[PDB]
Predict the structure.
Amino acid sequence: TPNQVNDELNKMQAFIRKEAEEKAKEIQLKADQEYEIEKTNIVRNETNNID
Amino acid sequence: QKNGIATLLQAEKEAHEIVSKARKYRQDKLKQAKTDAAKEIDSYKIQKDKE
Amino acid sequence: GATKILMDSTHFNEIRSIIRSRSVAWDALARSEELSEIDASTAKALESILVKKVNGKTLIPLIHLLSTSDNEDCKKSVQNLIAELLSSDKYGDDTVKFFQEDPKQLEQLFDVSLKGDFQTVLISGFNVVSLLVQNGLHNVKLVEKLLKNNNLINILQNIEQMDTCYVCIRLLQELAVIPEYRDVIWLHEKKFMPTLFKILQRATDHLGIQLQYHSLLLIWLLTFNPVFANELVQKYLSDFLDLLKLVKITIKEKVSRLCISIILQCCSTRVKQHKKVIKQLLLLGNALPTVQSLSERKYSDEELRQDISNLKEILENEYQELTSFDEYVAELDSKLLCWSPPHVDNGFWSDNIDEFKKDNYKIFRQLIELLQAKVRNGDVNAKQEKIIIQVALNDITHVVELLPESIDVLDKTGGKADIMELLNHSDSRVKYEALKATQAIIGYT
């Protein structure tokens, strides 16, 4: 029935929402890691030049 | 049926929006990295002048 | 209202639906004078205002039934309504603001949280976890207090109930959302290690794959810190090598790419002495063939495939040097060889055996290129050049012995004529090696 159909649709939207959530979380984590890495590299080069 | 199909289309659109948000997050991470590198560079120049 | 997580899993939804479905009358408790009449009235009104004005009035009043609870169902319903108000769209950030105003107000709440039965230790812990990492309020006190909780200890360590386990895990991850608050999590990670290894072992055998995915997500979040990733593989080696193997059999690419990125973060150059980890993993764990099959596999996600190729390249980086094939590559590129048992040892030859032919035997072509260039041009044999051409002769001999299909190229490379033309040389040793390669070519015709 259409009730279980709508439940299936909401389930699909739920799975998509979960995928998007995990994607956003991974995006934030990768952003943090990239920030730390870039900061470390820039600090290394700057320390080299300054030294 | 059409409601679920529209929910699927909106789900794909939400996925693409999540990807775009991830890209914007990456660009923002690069920008923050550039800012931190700028601050570290100014600090290194100030330290060099102080030395 | 502001940063409300844990709305994803249907387990928390069913749990919240089961807890909020309890039948209790605050008016009956007010008539029996079980608690503060004003607080009971505000609660009775808030119940009808929920199930279907601003907050802060019932905030202080709820503490009266919180710090002191004569009934278990009363405190359970209180914590349930609290957590429901935390995720409420009507109130939302307002409630958070009420938590943001007084930092010590949530202290006693967290102190009264997670006690007695597992049912009452759920909602209170959920609200506490929600507030702890919420927006601007961050304290190591609440984290340390929740970490030392024996009530949530058995809840997280329960292999029986999947609901409580997934709840405790998701709460751990939500609390680990802030890396700065994950330090104690890195300190208390010893207890989480058991459930992680248990989930890893259970991985090898509906929504039941979400819990392990969240656990791996927590592992990857802990892998964000190179310090926590430094003692990662230095703790449990058994569960470490069980990552990619179980990831290959894993249907979804989520937990798979999670374990992949986690192992990659473990072997990352950002980690000190991470080369030995990937080395042992590719040695005693047979990660070479797994990475090869993964490279031959397909992935829907771009990040997953990119991390896959990156991990494969990273592995192949230190895989080529064991047994270093780059040592012979240096001699080949510089067109100057020396005395080493690279082609003498069957093992060393077997290590680079798979790398002998990639595209149209490019490595073999470059290997025969030196001899060919020493054939059509040069071909004055004295000292170095002679022993180099001889070593190349023996190496190409062992190579042809290993690879039967390497003959067809030698005929089109003009090496078939040059090898036979090397029968008569200035040195008897060079002629011996050339005759050995001749008999080798006579082995398969």
